[PDB]
Every structure is written in C-alpha cells, then in structure tokens.
Design an enzyme around this catalytic site. Structure first.
Site, PDB file in Angstrom:
ATOM      1  N   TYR A  16      -6.661   8.028  14.535  1.00  0.00           N
ATOM      2  CA  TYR A  16      -6.236   6.700  13.551  1.00  0.00           C
ATOM      3  C   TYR A  16      -7.882   6.135  13.553  1.00  0.00           C
ATOM      4  O   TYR A  16      -8.919   6.165  14.448  1.00  0.00           O
ATOM      5  CB  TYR A  16      -5.465   5.651  13.482  1.00  0.00           C
ATOM      6  CG  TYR A  16      -5.259   4.141  12.948  1.00  0.00           C
ATOM      7  CD1 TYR A  16      -4.985   4.194  11.576  1.00  0.00           C
ATOM      8  CD2 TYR A  16      -6.267   3.064  13.433  1.00  0.00           C
ATOM      9  CE1 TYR A  16      -5.608   2.918  11.028  1.00  0.00           C
ATOM     10  CE2 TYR A  16      -6.185   2.093  13.438  1.00  0.00           C
ATOM     11  CZ  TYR A  16      -5.805   2.460  11.847  1.00  0.00           C
ATOM     12  OH  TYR A  16      -5.793   0.887  11.456  1.00  0.00           O
ATOM     13  N   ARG A  33       1.291  -9.992  13.728  1.00  0.00           N
ATOM     14  CA  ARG A  33       0.319  -9.684  13.043  1.00  0.00           C
ATOM     15  C   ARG A  33       0.802  -9.798  11.128  1.00  0.00           C
ATOM     16  O   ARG A  33       0.350  -8.903  10.488  1.00  0.00           O
ATOM     17  CB  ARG A  33      -0.596  -8.227  13.464  1.00  0.00           C
ATOM     18  CG  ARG A  33      -0.575  -7.792  14.364  1.00  0.00           C
ATOM     19  CD  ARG A  33      -2.199  -7.783  14.445  1.00  0.00           C
ATOM     20  NE  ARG A  33      -2.372  -7.016  13.623  1.00  0.00           N
ATOM     21  CZ  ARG A  33      -3.429  -6.776  13.213  1.00  0.00           C
ATOM     22  NH1 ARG A  33      -4.423  -8.587  12.847  1.00  0.00           N
ATOM     23  NH2 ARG A  33      -3.599  -5.464  12.145  1.00  0.00           N
ATOM     24  N   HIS A  92      -1.884   1.890  16.928  1.00  0.00           N
ATOM     25  CA  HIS A  92      -1.085   2.657  16.071  1.00  0.00           C
ATOM     26  C   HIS A  92      -0.039   3.390  15.641  1.00  0.00           C
ATOM     27  O   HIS A  92       0.497   4.306  15.451  1.00  0.00           O
ATOM     28  CB  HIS A  92      -2.056   3.431  14.862  1.00  0.00           C
ATOM     29  CG  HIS A  92      -2.553   3.027  13.535  1.00  0.00           C
ATOM     30  ND1 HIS A  92      -1.499   3.353  12.581  1.00  0.00           N
ATOM     31  CD2 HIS A  92      -2.610   1.881  12.621  1.00  0.00           C
ATOM     32  CE1 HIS A  92      -1.961   3.424  11.159  1.00  0.00           C
ATOM     33  NE2 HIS A  92      -2.522   1.789  11.575  1.00  0.00           N
ATOM     34  N   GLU A 100       2.240  -5.884  11.801  1.00  0.00           N
ATOM     35  CA  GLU A 100       1.831  -5.606  10.489  1.00  0.00           C
ATOM     36  C   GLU A 100       2.895  -5.057   9.804  1.00  0.00           C
ATOM     37  O   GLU A 100       2.661  -4.934   8.057  1.00  0.00           O
ATOM     38  CB  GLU A 100       0.708  -4.984  10.576  1.00  0.00           C
ATOM     39  CG  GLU A 100       0.883  -3.442  10.739  1.00  0.00           C
ATOM     40  CD  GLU A 100      -0.823  -2.795  10.770  1.00  0.00           C
ATOM     41  OE1 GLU A 100      -1.806  -3.094  11.915  1.00  0.00           O
ATOM     42  OE2 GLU A 100      -0.331  -1.815   9.962  1.00  0.00           O
ATOM     43  N   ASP A 125      -6.162  -0.688  18.141  1.00  0.00           N
ATOM     44  CA  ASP A 125      -4.783  -0.683  17.500  1.00  0.00           C
ATOM     45  C   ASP A 125      -5.044   1.298  18.092  1.00  0.00           C
ATOM     46  O   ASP A 125      -5.373   1.972  17.850  1.00  0.00           O
ATOM     47  CB  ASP A 125      -5.467  -0.122  15.886  1.00  0.00           C
ATOM     48  CG  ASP A 125      -3.508  -0.971  15.640  1.00  0.00           C
ATOM     49  OD1 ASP A 125      -3.263  -0.168  15.851  1.00  0.00           O
ATOM     50  OD2 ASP A 125      -4.129  -1.128  14.101  1.00  0.00           O
ATOM     51  N   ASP A 149      -6.189  -3.451   2.055  1.00  0.00           N
ATOM     52  CA  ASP A 149      -5.316  -3.610   0.573  1.00  0.00           C
ATOM     53  C   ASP A 149      -3.960  -4.598   1.235  1.00  0.00           C
ATOM     54  O   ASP A 149      -3.053  -4.978  -0.136  1.00  0.00           O
ATOM     55  CB  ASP A 149      -3.696  -1.977   1.320  1.00  0.00           C
ATOM     56  CG  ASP A 149      -3.866  -2.396   2.977  1.00  0.00           C
ATOM     57  OD1 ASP A 149      -4.408  -1.850   3.436  1.00  0.00           O
ATOM     58  OD2 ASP A 149      -2.821  -2.143   2.696  1.00  0.00           O
ATOM     59  N   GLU A 180      -7.831 -10.532  10.703  1.00  0.00           N
ATOM     60  CA  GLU A 180      -8.815  -9.397  10.502  1.00  0.00           C
ATOM     61  C   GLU A 180      -9.489  -9.754   9.570  1.00  0.00           C
ATOM     62  O   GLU A 180      -9.264 -10.177   8.024  1.00  0.00           O
ATOM     63  CB  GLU A 180      -7.714  -8.601  10.434  1.00  0.00           C
ATOM     64  CG  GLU A 180      -8.140  -7.039  10.362  1.00  0.00           C
ATOM     65  CD  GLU A 180      -7.225  -6.025  10.054  1.00  0.00           C
ATOM     66  OE1 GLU A 180      -5.927  -6.528   9.875  1.00  0.00           O
ATOM     67  OE2 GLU A 180      -7.316  -4.885  10.534  1.00  0.00           O
ATOM     68  N   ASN A 232       0.372  -1.517  -0.087  1.00  0.00           N
ATOM     69  CA  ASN A 232       0.128  -0.104   0.016  1.00  0.00           C
ATOM     70  C   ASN A 232       1.329   1.274  -0.134  1.00  0.00           C
ATOM     71  O   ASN A 232       2.116   1.062   0.763  1.00  0.00           O
ATOM     72  CB  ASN A 232      -0.684  -0.117   1.080  1.00  0.00           C
ATOM     73  CG  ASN A 232      -2.325   0.730   1.399  1.00  0.00           C
ATOM     74  OD1 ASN A 232      -2.554   1.156   0.172  1.00  0.00           O
ATOM     75  ND2 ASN A 232      -2.554   1.321   1.939  1.00  0.00           N
ATOM     76  N   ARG A 276     -12.649  -4.670  16.455  1.00  0.00           N
ATOM     77  CA  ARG A 276     -11.242  -3.908  17.063  1.00  0.00           C
ATOM     78  C   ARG A 276     -12.382  -1.958  17.526  1.00  0.00           C
ATOM     79  O   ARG A 276     -12.814  -1.848  16.002  1.00  0.00           O
ATOM     80  CB  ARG A 276     -11.062  -3.910  16.029  1.00  0.00           C
ATOM     81  CG  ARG A 276      -9.256  -2.060  16.020  1.00  0.00           C
ATOM     82  CD  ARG A 276      -8.270  -2.155  15.279  1.00  0.00           C
ATOM     83  NE  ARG A 276      -9.126  -1.206  14.055  1.00  0.00           N
ATOM     84  CZ  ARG A 276      -8.246  -0.389  13.288  1.00  0.00           C
ATOM     85  NH1 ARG A 276      -7.353  -1.018  12.853  1.00  0.00           N
ATOM     86  NH2 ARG A 276      -8.946   0.353  12.873  1.00  0.00           N
ATOM     87  N   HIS A 330      -2.806  -9.540   9.787  1.00  0.00           N
ATOM     88  CA  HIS A 330      -2.936  -7.994   9.017  1.00  0.00           C
ATOM     89  C   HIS A 330      -3.621  -8.806   7.994  1.00  0.00           C
ATOM     90  O   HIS A 330      -3.430  -9.219   7.067  1.00  0.00           O
ATOM     91  CB  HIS A 330      -1.918  -7.604   8.368  1.00  0.00           C
ATOM     92  CG  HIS A 330      -2.138  -6.031   8.370  1.00  0.00           C
ATOM     93  ND1 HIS A 330      -1.540  -5.464   6.881  1.00  0.00           N
ATOM     94  CD2 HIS A 330      -3.218  -5.320   9.049  1.00  0.00           C
ATOM     95  CE1 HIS A 330      -1.739  -4.158   7.394  1.00  0.00           C
ATOM     96  NE2 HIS A 330      -3.064  -3.732   8.095  1.00  0.00           N
ATOM     97  N   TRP A 341       2.696   7.657  11.550  1.00  0.00           N
ATOM     98  CA  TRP A 341       0.643   7.703  11.928  1.00  0.00           C
ATOM     99  C   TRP A 341       0.766   5.582  11.920  1.00  0.00           C
ATOM    100  O   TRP A 341       1.514   5.470  11.603  1.00  0.00           O
ATOM    101  CB  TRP A 341       0.750   8.267  10.398  1.00  0.00           C
ATOM    102  CG  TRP A 341      -0.990   7.559   9.881  1.00  0.00           C
ATOM    103  CD1 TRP A 341      -1.957   8.376  10.171  1.00  0.00           C
ATOM    104  CD2 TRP A 341      -1.141   6.385   8.993  1.00  0.00           C
ATOM    105  NE1 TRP A 341      -2.912   7.637   9.794  1.00  0.00           N
ATOM    106  CE2 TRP A 341      -2.610   6.527   9.466  1.00  0.00           C
ATOM    107  CE3 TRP A 341      -0.504   5.437   8.893  1.00  0.00           C
ATOM    108  CZ2 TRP A 341      -3.758   5.538   8.217  1.00  0.00           C
ATOM    109  CZ3 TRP A 341      -1.359   5.015   7.821  1.00  0.00           C
ATOM    110  CH2 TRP A 341      -3.257   4.844   7.876  1.00  0.00           C
ATOM    111  N   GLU A 357      -2.622  -3.739  20.159  1.00  0.00           N
ATOM    112  CA  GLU A 357      -1.692  -3.595  19.056  1.00  0.00           C
ATOM    113  C   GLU A 357      -0.969  -2.621  17.952  1.00  0.00           C
ATOM    114  O   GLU A 357      -1.242  -1.584  19.234  1.00  0.00           O
ATOM    115  CB  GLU A 357      -3.401  -3.351  17.965  1.00  0.00           C
ATOM    116  CG  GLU A 357      -2.452  -3.715  16.777  1.00  0.00           C
ATOM    117  CD  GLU A 357      -3.131  -3.657  15.241  1.00  0.00           C
ATOM    118  OE1 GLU A 357      -2.606  -3.898  14.054  1.00  0.00           O
ATOM    119  OE2 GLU A 357      -4.096  -4.608  15.910  1.00  0.00           O
TER     120      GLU A 357
HETATM  121 MG   LIG Z   1      -2.749  -2.102  12.518  1.00  0.00          MG
END
Ligand SMILES: [Mg+2]
Ligand SMILES: [Cl-]
Ligand SMILES: [Mg+2]
Ligand SMILES: [Mg+2]
Ligand SMILES: [Mg+2]
Lengths: 393, 397
Positions: free
Chosen positions: A159, A274, A203, A253, A201, A307, A330, A37, A147, A303, A393, A227
């Site tokens: 996020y 993940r 993130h 991930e 998450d 994407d 997921e 992605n 989630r 994950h 991010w 996560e």
């Molecule tokens: Mg995640």
C-alpha cells in the site's frame, strides 16, 4: 428557501467525482460531495432516482429534518451508498444556510477555534531510501507532518489507488511487512529528527495481536498515529492493540455511521477518528461524532484523499477550523483540472490550510467545464495473500 | 466453468423487483434477488456498473472467494445497497452450484432437517373486530400462526393497516402517537386469545416506534397473551437498545429485517437479547453470510425468522425455503403472497400447503425468471412511507 431544483453532476477531471447541487426558489444554491470511490454510480443512482425527487419543494432551511427524513425514511439504515447520498444533501444544505446567513461555514458552526489547520502529506517510495527522499521534499514544502510508506522487500506490491478499470490484484505478506516496517520509522527519525510528526497507515492488513506487536515495535519512534491496523466491523478488534501498546491509534475512513465507532470511542480504544464528511453523513452527523469523541480525548483526523472532492475539502477545512478537538487534516492535492472544475477559496500555505471567508463552504462547481470530463470507470485494487487468499487491501 | 455473462433484470409485475442472472460458458445459469424496496435503482447501478464487469471470466464455482472479493474488495463494507448486491451474486452462484451438483439447494446445504416449513400470515384491519375476521379467515386456510395488527383509535394511520407499504411515488406521510398505541395494543391480543384460544401462534410487529422502556412496558403488558414474538420494538443501530426490554419482559423478541451484516447483530445474539433473527437472504449477503448468522444464533438458542414481504422476490423465497428446510435452528417463515403476475414472471417449484412451505426438488433453488414476461412490466418508482409524531417530528416508520 424552498428547493426548486436538485440534481447530480458526474465528472472525471483526473478521477471521478459525483456532486449534488440544490437550488432554492430564490436562486441561492448549495453543493455537496457524493463521491464514493469505485462505487460512484451507485450513489449517483441512489440520489437521482430516490432522493432528488423527494427534495423538490422541501424547505432547504430544515437541515435536521431533512437529515432524519433521509436517514430514517430510507428504512434501510446506514451504509456507504446510503450515508454518502445523505452527506451530499447535508453538505449542500449547510452551504445554502451559510450563504443565507452571509457567513463562511466555520462561523455558522460556532466560530474559529484555531488560526490555521495543520495537514500531513503522503511520502511513499519503493525503498526506505526512496521514501526518505520524499520526506525531505515535503519538509521543504513546509509540511510539519508526513505519512510514510515504503515497499516491502520480497513483495511486489504494498500500500491514485483507483488505477485500473477492473480491480488490480496485489500480493501481500504480513510477516515480511512486520519485520520491515519498524526499519522505515527508525530511518525517518535518524535522518529528520524528533520534531517532525510521522504517521503510518497499516491499511487493514493485520490481526489484532499482530498490530499489538507492531505498535510496541514502533513505540521508540513516537508516531503521530498508526492507522487502520485491523478491519473493525467488529469494534472489539481494537482492544488487544490498545492493551498492548502506547502508540497512538487512528481508524475510521471506511466508516459511515456513529454506530460504527461509538464503542471504539467510549472504550478509549482509539486516539483519532478518521471518518470524513462525504462518507459520514455530512456536517450534521460528523458534529455528533466529533462531540462524542471529545468526551474521551479523541481528536478528528478526517480522511482527505484525492477521491473526496474539493467540495468535501472546503467544508472539512471549515469544520476543522471550528471543532475544538481537531487533530490533523490529510492533504492529497487534487489535479489542476479538478481545481478548475471546483473553484474554491480555501488556501494552502506553509503546511496548513486556511478557511475561506466567502459565505457558504466556499466551493462551487463549473458545470459547463465539468461536462467536458466524462466519467471513466475505475475500481480500487484487491489484495491476496501468497497462497491466493482474498485479503484486505 | 467461467462466467460468460452477467446482467440485471428490472421488472414491475405488481411491484418492483431486481434480479441478477449469471450465465456460465456452458450455458448453465443462476439467478439471485437484488430487490431493495424504495431504493431499487441504487442496487441496479451498484451491480450494473461496478460488480457485473468484475464477474466476467471468474470461476463460477468459487462462491466463497467471490463473496470475499466483493465484500472486502468494495473497500466500503456492509450496508443495504452493498450487501444486497453481494447477496444477489451469492444466490445466483449457489443456484449454479446446486444445478451442477444435480441437487435441490437444501441437499447441498446439508439435507433436510424438517418435513415442512411453518409460516405465518398477515392479519390486519381497522378495528380489532376487523382484524379478528381476518384471523378467522387465515385459520380456515390452514395457517398455524398469524401476525395481527389493527388501527389505533385517535390515529389515522398505523403500520400494517391499509397492504403494499410502498404505495406512492414519493413517500406518504403518516402520523403517530406512541401513548395511544401502548394503551390500545394489548386489547388486540386479548381479543385474539378470547376468540381463537391458546393453540394459535400470534405475532406482532412494533415496527420501530418505541423507546426501550416503552417496549419493556408493552412486553410486560402482553405476557398473558403469550405472543410468538414481539418484533422490531426499537431501532437497533445501537444494539444495546434491546437490553432494557430483555431485562423487563419474558415476551419473546424478534429483530433484524433492516440489518445486512452479522456485525449488526453479533452482540444482540451473544448477549441473548433476542429470540429470533429476521435478516433475510436478499438483504443479508446471501446464503454464504446467512449460514454464518444462523450458526452464531444457534449457540444462544436464537432461531431464524426470515423477513418475507412482497418486496423480496420469489427467487429469495425459494432460496429461503431451501435454507429453512436445512437449518437446524429454524423458527418460522413469513409469508406475504405475491401477485399472479409476479408468480408468472418467476416460475418456481416451492409449494404452500396446509399452512406450511415445502421445498422444491429441482436442481438449484428451483426458481427461474421468464425474461420475455418480465419485459412486459416496466419499472415504476414507489417509495416507503415516513412517519411523523403529532408535533411533526420525523419519527420511525
Ligand atoms: Mg488510510
Ligand atoms: Cl449501502
Ligand atoms: Mg489489562
Ligand atoms: Mg417487520
Ligand atoms: Mg438484572
């Protein structure tokens, strides 16, 4: 089973996907997901220019040799572009092997360990109340796990992440998030009770001692996992968290190698790994990661965002069906157009996936249809602190 | 000053190079090396499609912010394609900053720490005798240090013996025997010392082929010959792979040309498992990242030994010489001469005299690219070889 043709397909039926197809002299073919992605064309070029020409004439049956040939042979080892290219080849070769064996992929891996594959859904809202509405909606759809994410008051953005051509710019406050997040989980438990599995998450936005604080704060709500608490290029980043909380931890991930997580697993710093098939070097590599994880009671939590293509999802469901230390899968549903481009035999019913029975991983690609959805550039956002600091991010 | 334009240039003046050029609104410009041998077009696409469009309009002066923006913002972090793209941007931005400051790059970094930059040359041959002839030739040219490699009897092809590794469209396939190499290699160093004496610095590249205990054995066996370094003994994705070697030999160790991140070598350095870190600017995220790696290394007496093959362009070499001139914990700079055509495509002001490099004095890193000349040499695919054991096992090249 000598390879006669190998080539990529790039298509955008709702978002970008890159797929590798390998065709043998006999006519049997396999496909593998190659989607990275926001950097999609780097993998496309890696495959088109440097890998594909070397595949022609190779024995498609030599999965392990090909994996090592591409992994070691690249000279420059590991990395997201590198390992996604390798994963795409690996996934197509396992597809071919399962077809040649006349078996669905889970059978070729060692057979089924479970009768269905538990998933979780994404529940997101601006306010805590908005989020609770989404949880109710997904519980009614049969999800046993959700989630949860909500907006942070005082902060415009928290996020399809690849929403803009150039990276969107979000603003972040850690301190405001840390005070607000526990309220979301309290509210979920008050409204939906204790049987629902609740995931969150982080993130990548915290430091270790901040994540330790958050982990402690959310212990009463018994999360299925917390996560990606902290960036983990330095794997020791997890240690403070693990030493201070009993909230279960998930990470990975953004990883692409067993070498990104060997110490995380061996030191028992995480509960769920993940890293998915597309980004983690395919079936060949992820079997090894899952097996290492099993020695330390760590379970898989692939994950599974939009994407990663249905090719990855189908193979993942097969892998999930066999692997003893399965945790959860997921689920972010693809668009109808994406499903049409990638016909498949996996099924979703009552909050769970069921593996297909067709030989292979059970996914194909409609090339004629894929050609009707040209690539459209789309980048992932970036996050800055309130003072402008480029953050995670 | 904002970035007005940014683009890649791909040229093959003897071998493939990818260069990033960044041009500001005022017309000032900078260039960075983006060459990743055998995977060149992956970096070209990473830059062309995903990085370049995000550079337009950015403040060229914000080097650190741009580095973090690309590194963190990519979401998928580290890796050879990723970090080479980031390095190319970083080098071009430092080039621009130094030009704006009206200073050669070494001055911008903190000024000179040395008056010249010691190099080593590649000496290779089929037989030990052939290698010694090459040593004599390079000693005559003024090299104070030589890397020595020779053929292993009973093995058709070995590393560093013919040299341009990427010499085929598809990967050449070589065959390997560890046990034959281990019994033969010490004889080379013994011969070099017998003919040339003790003052010469002698290096050797193991090129990833041994297990840790095998490298321990080799290290011990070559102690009497006092090598400057024994390089890339074992694949090191698992950094603990160096531990047995370090616990069993006092032969100095070098590693890291295949690395791209400080996270590939933090533990190697902090545990004192190596003496030289080899990760170069082009593959290690540029000046911004490599300053950090060198500084961590300095806390543990580890010195720099930048990879300097033909497949890093003169842009990297010039920037590397500037870096080498400033960095306190400099060890040595590899020198593999570029072709005439390559040097013409990349005009530069660094110099080589009496076995050492001298940094340029022009503002910037002192390297430019002649785009009209570059256009005369189209890309030609060339892949690095693979190495198999005698039974066919895909091994480490
Ligand atoms: Mg995640
Ligand atoms: Cl990469
Ligand atoms: Mg304790
Ligand atoms: Mg080397
Ligand atoms: Mg001891």
């Amino acid at each position: 089973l000598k390879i006669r043709d190998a080539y990529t397909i790039v298509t955008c039926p709702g978002r970008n996907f890159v797929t590798l197809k390998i065709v043998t002299e006999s006519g049997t073919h396999g496909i593998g997901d190659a989607t990275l992605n926001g950097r999609e064309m780097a993998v496309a070029a890696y495959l088109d220019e440097h890998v594909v020409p070397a595949l022609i004439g190779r024995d498609a049956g030599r999965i392990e040799d090909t994996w090592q040939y591409l992994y070691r042979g690249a000279y420059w080892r590991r990395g997201p572009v590198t390992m996604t290219a390798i994963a795409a080849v690996d996934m197509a070769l396992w597809d071919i092997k399962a077809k040649a064996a006349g078996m669905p992929l889970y059978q070729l891996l060692g057979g089924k360990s479970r009768e269905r594959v538990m998933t979780y859904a994404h529940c997101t809202g601006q306010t805590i109340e908005d989020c609770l509405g989404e949880v109710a909606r997904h519980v009614e759809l049969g999800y046993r796990a959700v989630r949860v994410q909500s907006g942070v008051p005082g902060i415009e953005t928290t996020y399809e992440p690849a929403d803009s051509s150039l990276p969107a710019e979000h603003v972040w406050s850690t301190e405001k998030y840390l005070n607000h997040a526990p309220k979301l989980f309290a509210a979920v438990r008050e409204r939906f009770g204790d049987d629902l599995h609740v995931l969150h998450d982080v993130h990548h936005r915290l430091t270790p001692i901040e994540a330790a604080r958050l982990g402690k704060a959310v212990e009463p709500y018994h999360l299925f996992w917390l996560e990606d608490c902290v960036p983990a290029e330095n794997q020791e980043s997890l240690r403070l968290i693990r030493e201070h909380t009993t909230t279960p931890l998930a990470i990975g991930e953004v990883f692409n190698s067993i070498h990104d997580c060997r110490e995380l697993i061996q030191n028992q710093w995480i509960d769920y790994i993940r890293m998915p098939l597309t980004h983690g070097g395919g079936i060949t590599a992820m079997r090894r990661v899952a097996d290492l994880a099993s020695l330390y009671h760590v379970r898989t939590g692939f994950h599974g965002p939009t994407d990663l293509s249905p090719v990855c999802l189908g193979a993942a469901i097969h892998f999930d069906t066999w692997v003893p230390n399965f945790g959860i899968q997921e689920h972010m549903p693809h668009t109808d157009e994406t499903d049409a481009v990638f016909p498949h035999d996996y099924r979703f019913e009552d909050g769970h996936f069921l593996a297909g029975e067709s030989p292979g991983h059970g996914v194909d690609i409609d090339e004629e249809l894929a050609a009707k959805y040209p690539y459209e550039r789309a980048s992932l956002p970036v996050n800055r602190l309130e003072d402008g600091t480029l953050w995670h991010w």
